[PDB]
């Protein structure tokens, strides 16, 4: 199923050299405020079942470590040239068949919107049940699932302000409590750094895939922020492999510092409160000291969710509905069916219990990492066609538009990762990056792997007055 007479527009357009504005410091800032999200509190919470609170600080920095290792390779395409993830997805898969992951992956950002509005509730409802003792989880889930949709079309700077300041404001509060908890549970960081592991069983191998598969979504598609990084049009195999690692570590000094802290304060609220649930362990810790504040601590989680959320979870599935189903939704109806869609997945309970298995789920998406890197790196040796990636009939159209051997490789890749269960991701990424070269040298039969109109790549990025 594809659709005929297709149009490729300014939203997906490539970033030029006269637009880039993200230097490795400022990209290191979008990785600090990016290690700060409730997906991480909780992951590091439930870990305390099988390992102590230091082991999780070792697995934490361990995830992010393998995560910068994939970041390096993946980021490269985007920085060099300046493209969406929506745009680069078209290399291993077709230009009409690149939508298989572009969709499977725009369904995550919705899931992380259900799971995120769900704390908007816990926080809107904790502030009103500690004010009126009445509790309505699902009313708030819907009042919040309405507010977003409105401030989506007509948002003012007042939310924007809240963006950058939010992650830090919560990292500040998120440690302060750890003072509070280590002060009332009368334990020292030294006693606390060893209180988990009263139910060993899970392998550490699986303990690292967790924090891996938490980032996978952001890593596979960094293309979307990376395409604003100062890059040099006049640098070589050296000057451009040095800016690759300059960024690739500009990111590791933002994500592993910050997300070893939310990893901690989250395993601390567990083996020190009992609650992986932020909002709950929050009201419970600061309201067991100040309920004039436990309400200001839940007025925060509410306000900081109410600016983070939309940006990173609702915008993308919105613009994919007007793209993949043009005559069907508006920006006003894409936004609204997006909301309804996420809410209706019922995320929060999936997490709560086996979030450990939704992060071994969002980590069985390794073959896509191995497939995309193998392509921009091993199969096309960094040679790409800016002109063919923007035309219905290009050398990436393959079988009418879908690359069937790239979906096949992904499939062989998965089945070979069930031959190694505690190291799946590591063996689903290794298997797909080695098995994509052959399938691309087999299409190197039915299709060219390059074009002679590619000498125009520089025509797309250098300013045109």
């Amino acid at each position: 199923i594809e659709e005929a007479r297709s149009l490729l527009n300014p939203s997906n357009a490539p970033t030029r050299y006269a637009e880039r504005s993200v230097g490795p410091f400022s990209l290191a800032a979008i990785w600090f405020a990016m290690a700060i999200q409730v997906a991480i509190f909780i992951a590091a919470g439930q870990m305390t079942s099988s390992f102590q609170v230091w082991q999780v600080i070792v697995a934490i920095a361990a995830g992010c470590t393998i995560a910068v290792i994939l970041l390096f390779f993946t980021q490269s395409a985007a920085i060099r040239w300046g493209i969406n993830f929506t745009v680069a997805a078209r290399m291993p898969f077709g230009i009409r068949g690149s939508l298989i992951p572009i969709t499977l992956k725009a369904l995550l950002s919705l899931f992380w919107f259900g799971f995120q509005t769900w704390l908007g509730a816990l926080a809107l409802d904790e502030i009103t049940r500690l004010l009126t003792g009445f509790t309505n989880l699902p009313l708030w889930i819907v009042i919040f699932g309405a507010i977003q949709v409105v401030t989506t079309f007509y948002g003012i700077t007042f939310i924007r302000w809240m963006n950058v300041f939010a992650s830090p404001v919560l990292l500040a509060m998120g440690v302060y409590m750890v003072y509070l908890m280590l002060d009332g549970a009368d334990v020292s960081l030294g006693e606390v750094m060893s209180m988990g592991g009263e139910n060993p069983g899970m392998p550490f191998s699986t303990a690292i895939m967790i924090f891996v598969g938490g980032w996978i979504a952001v890593v596979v598609s960094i293309h979307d922020i990376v395409k604003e990084c100062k890059v040099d049009p006049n640098a070589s195999r050296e000057g451009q492999t040095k800016a690759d690692a300059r960024y690739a570590t500009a990111q590791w000094l933002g994500m592993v510092p910050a997300s070893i802290i939310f990893g901690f304060i989250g395993a601390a609220s567990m083996v020190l409160v009992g609650e992986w649930n932020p909002v709950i362990a929050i009201t419970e810790v600061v309201g067991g000291v100040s309920i004039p504040m436990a309400i200001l601590f839940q007025v925060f989680v509410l306000l900081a969710t109410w600016s983070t959320n939309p940006a990173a979870n609702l915008l993308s599935p919105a613009y994919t509905l007007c793209s993949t189903f043009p005559r069907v939704f508006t920006f006003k109806t894409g936004v609204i069916v997006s909301a309804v869609v996420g809410l209706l997945m019922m995320p929060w309970q999936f997490a709560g219990v086996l979030n450990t298995f939704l992060n071994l789920l969002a980590s069985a998406l390794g073959p896509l990492a191995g497939i995309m890197i193998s392509d921009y790196f091993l199969v096309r040796r960094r040679r790409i066609s800016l002109h063919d990636l923007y035309r219905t009939k290009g050398i990436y159209t393959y079988w009418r538009g879908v690359n069937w051997v790239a979906l096949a490789v992904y499939a062989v890749a998965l089945a070979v990762s069930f031959l190694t269960p505690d190291l799946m991701f590591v063996t689903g990424l290794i298997a797909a990056l080695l098995l994509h070269i052959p399938a691309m040298r087999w299409v190197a039969k039915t299709f060219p792997l390059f074009s002679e109109a590619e000498s125009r790549n520089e025509d797309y990025l250098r300013p045109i007055g």
Side-chain angles (χ1 to χ4, degrees):
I1 316 181
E2 338 141 355
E3 297 190 331
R5 169 184 168 179
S6 80
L7 310 169
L8 323 175
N9 293 317
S11 28
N12 313 282
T15 309
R16 299 177 185 267
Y17 306 119
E19 294 162 16
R20 316 296 185 99
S21 70
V22 177
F25 173 112
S26 230
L27 155 65
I30 320 157
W31 255 106
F32 161 76
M34 203 151 72
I36 301 193
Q37 76 174 42
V38 189
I40 189 194
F41 240 148
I42 318 190
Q46 311 183 21
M47 281 258 318
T48 69
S49 184
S50 297
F51 310 106
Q52 6 193 355
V53 194
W54 64 266
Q55 265 155 342
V56 194
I57 303 279
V58 141
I60 283 168
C64 312
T65 269
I66 317 194
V68 160
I69 302 191
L70 296 212
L71 268 160
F72 183 95
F73 295 51
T74 73
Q75 74 204 202
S76 182
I79 331 197
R80 207 311 149 189
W81 304 108
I83 57 179
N84 262 15
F85 166 38
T86 340
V87 171
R90 293 163 192 170
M91 220 96 74
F93 320 107
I95 300 171
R96 311 170 212 181
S98 82
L99 269 153
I100 317 146
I102 292 182
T103 272
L104 186 168
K105 182 269 188 163
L107 295 172
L108 262 270
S109 56
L110 287 156
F111 173 83
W112 296 117
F113 182 59
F115 194 94
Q116 190 89 355
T117 290
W118 166 81
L119 297 159
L122 304 187
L124 245 184
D125 189 34
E126 204 77 46
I127 75 181
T128 57
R129 86 77 160 185
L130 282 201
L131 274 196
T132 315
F134 82 83
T135 286
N136 200 347
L137 178 74
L139 166 69
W140 296 118
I141 258 199
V142 147
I143 291 177
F144 207 70
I147 306 162
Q148 304 303 333
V149 175
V150 189
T151 61
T152 297
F153 318 120
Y154 316 103
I156 304 197
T157 334
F158 296 90
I159 330 158
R160 195 61 168 187
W161 266 351
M162 300 225 47
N163 193 27
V164 176
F165 289 97
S167 336
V169 145
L170 290 219
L171 179 31
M173 173 196 72
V175 154
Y176 164 40
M177 290 191 172
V178 160
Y179 169 65
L180 279 194
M181 329 151 57
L182 285 208
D183 206 78
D186 218 56
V187 205
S188 64
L189 216 107
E191 304 180 313
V192 140
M193 198 97 61
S194 67
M195 319 210 81
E198 208 51 13
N199 202 172
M202 158 182 44
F204 201 59
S205 45
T206 278
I208 324 186
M209 327 281 46
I210 289 199
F211 303 95
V212 167
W215 295 114
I216 275 303
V218 170
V219 151
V220 152
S221 78
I222 19 69
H223 298 88
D224 296 318
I225 324 190
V226 156
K227 62 154 196 174
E228 286 147 26
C229 302
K230 295 179 168 197
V231 73
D232 198 36
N234 307 334
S236 64
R237 297 291 183 185
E238 316 281 286
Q240 194 64 40
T241 292
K242 281 301 209 314
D244 258 25
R246 182 169 79 255
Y247 280 104
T249 277
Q251 291 177 347
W252 187 103
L253 299 167
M255 78 149 326
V256 198
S259 96
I260 279 222
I261 303 174
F262 268 91
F264 181 76
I265 65 193
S269 290
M270 173 54 61
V271 87
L272 197 77
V273 154
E275 300 284 335
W276 45 258
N277 195 331
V279 166
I280 272 187
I282 287 163
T283 324
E284 198 207 44
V285 167
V286 299
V289 186
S290 63
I291 319 173
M293 288 209 80
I295 286 180
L296 309 173
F297 289 104
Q298 298 299 341
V299 157
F300 266 71
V301 169
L302 180 62
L303 265 22
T305 289
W306 178 81
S307 49
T308 291
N309 230 355
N313 291 328
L314 209 62
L315 279 175
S316 289
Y319 287 96
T320 288
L321 295 192
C322 296
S323 164
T324 304
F325 303 78
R327 32 170 204 174
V328 202
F329 314 60
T330 309
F331 174 52
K332 299 221 147 211
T333 299
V335 164
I336 298 179
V337 183
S338 300
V340 186
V341 154
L343 306 169
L344 298 171
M345 301 179 60
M346 291 296 90
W348 46 84
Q349 187 57 17
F350 196 72
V353 190
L354 293 188
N355 191 327
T356 284
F357 297 42
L358 175 102
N359 273 140
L360 266 179
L361 257 177
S363 87
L365 192 87
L368 167 61
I371 276 187
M372 275 200 54
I373 272 168
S374 184
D375 187 311
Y376 175 66
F377 268 77
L378 307 205
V379 167
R380 307 195 193 274
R381 298 175 179 190
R382 281 176 156 187
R383 202 142 36 104
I384 65 164
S385 165
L386 284 215
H387 168 77
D388 282 41
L389 285 175
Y390 280 58
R391 303 288 181 187
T392 281
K393 288 142 192 165
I395 62 154
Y396 302 121
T397 313
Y398 305 92
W399 288 270
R400 203 149 148 198
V402 147
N403 186 343
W404 295 106
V405 294
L407 302 219
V409 166
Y410 184 121
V412 182
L414 279 184
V416 171
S417 82
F418 286 91
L419 317 180
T420 63
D422 300 330
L423 327 149
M424 181 207 42
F425 170 95
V426 204
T427 278
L429 164 165
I430 290 289
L433 207 152
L434 296 201
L435 293 196
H436 175 72
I437 315 167
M440 273 303 90
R441 290 309 201 167
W442 177 101
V443 177
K445 301 165 186 172
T446 314
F447 300 105
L449 307 175
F450 329 75
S451 84
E452 273 209 0
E454 61 164 297
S455 56
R456 313 210 331 96
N457 291 341
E458 281 316 315
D459 289 350
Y460 280 111
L461 309 178
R462 210 194 173 181
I464 300 178

